[PDB]
Write a protein that binds this ligand. Structure first.
Ligand SMILES: CN[C@@H]1CCc2c(ccc(O)c2O)[C@H]1O
Lengths: 53, 286, 333, 232
């Protein structure tokens, strides 16, 4: 029934391993710091480089 | 009485500043924000432009003439100033007439008003109402048709000092009618119809949900027509009167009523541009 | 019957305990020493006019120039942002629409709405390529996995993977309690997440067709979904005036974006390139730009007459444009 | 090169088409049919005649109606409609919805939710009381007391200003006026005059409901225009 389809789903969803939140936060910070050089919204763009202006 | 002259100049400058400030505020509110761009708001923009050009052109020159008791500029510039004055007054009053007609069609024909009025139609009617105003003002003044046969008037028309208005039966009557009397009757008829519709709607509401928990309409109509009739009716009445009878009235009262008609333009932005959207835009600009 | 209910509660308690144990230190502590991005000022470079009614959804093309916007007037308009001119105009059989998408190949345009059918239009040929049917509710959002298969977020609480050529649902994902209101695709086609009108937001795997993780941080409904650019995180929008970020590997929420000045919901959320600025379109008349790591309102986008209902950043991250309930689009930079 | 000219020509053609579409779209008025499934919305829709659309025109005015078919978040789509048509089974006081509450009470709850919705603040709702003959039969004959099902009926009295229909019994008039007054009290409690409610007593036999819809749409537009200019 519906109860089995949910109990089995919860059983199969809690078995996955979890990485520490510190590692995930460090990964996000590293990605942002590495790719911030290529962000055109974050940093002002030159008039020649800016296509909209 | 130099104190009286100083006070008159001060109040004239105050009126000039108030008219210019209010009109530029309204026009920049219309221009800057695309939300206010509405088919009915084009008429408001036209009225604001007419009042603004009047306040920038004829109010300062008229005040200078009143204070200095003479016309310092050239003879042709006097005719140009008179033409600008007539054009501005006629355009403003006809713009109020157009706004009243647009409102009438908005209430009396709720379904057809959506398609009857369009942006292109609004532009065409604004251009037409500006063109008809110019024909009654620039064409007679520039082609010397309003020129009278009075001895002293024709004597001073050559003189550089005389810039006072002088006209015969024909131009005075025609200009007064076209500028004020037709708009007056059109606006009073359409506002009577709108008031009848509002009263019918209020009666329907009372019959519908009156058991559970027309002052506003009367107050709004008084604020709309009152500020216009009280400011322009005396001037045109005395216009027709003194043209009919030479010694009926003096010139000082005529100038005073004309200046009341001038200062009427200050109340128009407050009388019409009072929507909550207008107030929000003004607060944003401030 | 009731015996199995206790097992589900025990499993939920165990999952919550494991998630709590995983949270050694919040993201705010780790990012404390990093420098703020400062105030970000943006201006409306180009305003796209031509729409007849309110716009709900928009999707940038594979390139950074082409757009597509859906409105209740019954017309999809494809714009050219570089010159602010319309390219194509497509009518619809149904007046009311809720979503639109642009194929990565740049040849197909998918549109949905209250009509449960999903319409795909051939830009390169504007006839209806296929009218996908089978959902029993409105289509909140549709996306292009490729030029041959799409995924939809139906109102029947079931997101289903479609096949354009076959015209039938290849796989149907079920489990959400409420109606699904948002959907986003990961940089890879393997995974995608969908936010429903219930508190929970679920992660789905296309290869297996079974949900892998479920996040229930929010208290109100979900309205916007967007992955982090790398694909290891995603942020959600809610009607409770709170935007929250979740980490897939950590399986728990990291930070929440909220302010006492805002008591209105969020209608659209997208991530800027490099994942540093979180652009969220709020239910009020303006838009607030959030710092992804510091939860600081770096910039505010204002100038929309009505509620902002769409928001999207280009693939190359060149610019962002918002689709509001006013009939005008606005491209910011 | 010629790409700019081609794009300009495409823009000109699309702009002309969109101007024509805007004219025809502003020419017509939309309507939403939101009523209970047991209230006989289908028969009323047929009487005027995923989502069902109905097009009908009166006095060269094109009315366009949509019938849908839970917490509903599709309501936010209809934030700009001329009116919302609500059909309620006036005879459903006795019947209880399957799995139990009074059907009329469920309709009242739905009306309260719709009226107080944030997105529907400015939209007036047109109220249709369907199946009046069944209500008249139930009130005139049968062992069913309105007071037992609805406690407020015992204190309620027929208003003096109320005008009963020609050749109508007093008990049925009191019952129908109480049913109408429940909705009207739900409506008039909230709102600042932006949107109103227009109750109507209709039956399947009646064939003048389209004229009523036309008149009510005209009144709604007139009220909106009057309140916009601050004369109402
Ligand atoms: C110089 N003052 C003029 C004289 C006559 C006149 C005015 C305004 C509108 C008209 O239609 C007129 O005929 C006045 O402003």
């Amino acid at each position: 029934a519906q109860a089995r389809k949910l109990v089995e789903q919860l059983k199969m969803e809690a078995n996955i391993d979890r990485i520490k939140v510190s590692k995930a936060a460090a990964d996000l910070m590293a990605y942002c710091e590495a790719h911030a050089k290529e962000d055109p919204l974050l940093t002002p763009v030159p008039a020649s480089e800016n296509p909209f202006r | 009485d130099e104190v009286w002259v100083v006070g008159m100049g001060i109040v004239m400058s105050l009126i000039v500043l108030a008219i210019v400030f209010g009109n530029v505020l309204v026009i920049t509110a219309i221009a800057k924000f695309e939300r206010l761009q509405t088919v009915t708001n084009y008429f408001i923009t036209s009225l604001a432009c007419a009042d603004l050009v009047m306040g920038l052109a004829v109010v300062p020159f008229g005040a200078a003439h009143i204070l200095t008791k003479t016309w310092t500029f050239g003879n042709f510039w006097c005719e140009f100033w008179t033409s600008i004055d007539v054009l501005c007054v006629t355009a403003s009053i006809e713009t109020l007439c157009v706004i009243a007609v647009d409102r009438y069609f908005a209430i009396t024909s709720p379904f057809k008003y959506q398609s009857l009025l369009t942006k292109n139609k609004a532009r065409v009617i604004i251009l037409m109402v500006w063109i008809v105003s110019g024909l009654t003002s620039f064409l007679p003044i520039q082609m010397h048709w309003y020129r009278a046969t009075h001895q002293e008037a024709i004597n001073c028309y050559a003189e550089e000092t005389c810039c006072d208005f002088f006209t015969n039966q024909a131009y005075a009557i025609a200009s007064s009618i076209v500028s004020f009397y037709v708009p007056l009757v059109i606006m009073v008829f359409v506002y009577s119809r709108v008031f009848q519709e509002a009263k019918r709607q209020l009666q329907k509401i009372d019959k519908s949900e009156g058991r559970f928990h027309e002052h506003k309409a009367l107050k709004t109509l008084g604020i709309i027509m009152g500020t216009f009739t009280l400011c322009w009716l005396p001037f045109f009445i005395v216009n027709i009167v003194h043209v009919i009878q030479d010694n009926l009235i003096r010139k000082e009262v005529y100038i005073l009523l004309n200046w009341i008609g001038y200062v009427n333009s200050g109340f128009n932005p407050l009388i019409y541009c009072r929507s909550p959207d207008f107030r929000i835009a003004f607060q944003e600009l401030l | 019957l009731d015996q199995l209910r206790q097992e589900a509660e025990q499993l939920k308690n165990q999952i919550r305990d494991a998630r709590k144990a995983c949270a050694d230190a919040t993201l705010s502590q780790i990012t404390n020493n990093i420098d703020p991005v400062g105030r970000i000022q943006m201006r409306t470079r180009r305003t796209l006019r031509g729409h007849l009614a309110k716009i709900y959804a928009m999707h940038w093309g594979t390139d950074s120039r082409l757009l597509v916007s859906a409105s209740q007037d019954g017309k999809l308009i494809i714009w050219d942002s570089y010159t602010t001119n319309k390219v194509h105009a497509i009518p619809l059989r149904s007046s009311w629409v809720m979503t639109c998408a642009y194929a990565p190949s740049g040849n197909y345009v998918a549109c949905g709405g209250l009509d449960n059918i999903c319409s795909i239009y051939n830009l390169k040929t504007v006839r209806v390529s296929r009218e996908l049917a089978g959902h029993t509710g409105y289509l909140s959002c549709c996306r292009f996995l490729d030029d041959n298969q799409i995924v939809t977020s139906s109102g029947d609480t079931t997101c289903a993977l479609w096949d354009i050529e076959t015209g039938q649902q290849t796989t149907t994902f079920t489990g959400h309690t409420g109606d699904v209101m948002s959907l986003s695709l990961a940089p890879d086609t393997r995974l995608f997440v969908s936010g429903a009108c219930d508190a929970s937001a679920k992660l789905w795997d296309v290869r297996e067709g079974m949900c892998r993780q479920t996040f229930t941080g929010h208290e109100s409904d979900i309205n916007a979904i967007c992955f982090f650019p790398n694909g290891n995180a995603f942020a959600t929008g809610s009607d409770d005036a709170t935007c929250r970020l979740f980490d897939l590997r950590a399986d728990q929420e990291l930070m929440t974006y909220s302010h006492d000045n805002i008591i209105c919901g969020i209608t659209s959320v997208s991530f800027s390139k490099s994942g540093r600025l979180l652009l969220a379109g709020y239910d009020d008349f303006n838009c607030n730009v959030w710092d992804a790591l510091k939860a600081d309102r770096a910039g505010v986008l204002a100038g929309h007459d009505n509620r902002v209902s769409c928001l999207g950043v280009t693939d190359d991250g060149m610019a962002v444009a918002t689709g509001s309930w006013d009939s005008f689009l606005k491209i910011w930079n | 090169r010629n790409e700019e000219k081609a794009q300009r020509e495409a823009n000109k053609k699309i702009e002309k088409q969109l101007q024509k579409d805007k004219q025809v779209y502003r020419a017509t008025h939309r309507l939403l049919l939101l009523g209970a499934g047991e209230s006989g919305k289908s028969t009323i829709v047929k009487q005027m005649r995923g989502i069902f659309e109905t097009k009908f025109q009166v006095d060269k005015v094109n009315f366009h109606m949509f019938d849908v078919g839970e917490r509903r978040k599709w309501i936010q789509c209809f934030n700009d409609v001329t009116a919302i048509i609500f059909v309620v089974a006036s005879s459903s006081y006795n019947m209880v919805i399957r799995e139990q509450t009074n059907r009329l009470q469920e309709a009242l709850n739905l009306f309260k939710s719709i009226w107080n919705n944030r997105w529907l603040r400015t939209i007036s709702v047109i109220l249709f009381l369907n199946k009046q003959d069944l209500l008249a039969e139930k009130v005139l004959a049968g062992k069913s007391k309105i007071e037992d099902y609805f406690p407020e009926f015992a204190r309620y009295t027929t208003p003096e200003d109320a005008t009963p229909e020609p050749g109508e019994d007093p008990r049925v008039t009191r019952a129908k006026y109480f049913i109408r007054d429940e909705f009207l009290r739900i409506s008039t409690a909230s709102g600042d005059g932006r949107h109103y409610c227009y109750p109507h007593f209709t039956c399947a036999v009646d064939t003048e409901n389209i004229r009523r819809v036309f008149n009510d749409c005209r009144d709604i537009i007139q009220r909106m225009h009057l309140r916009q200019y601050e004369l109402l």
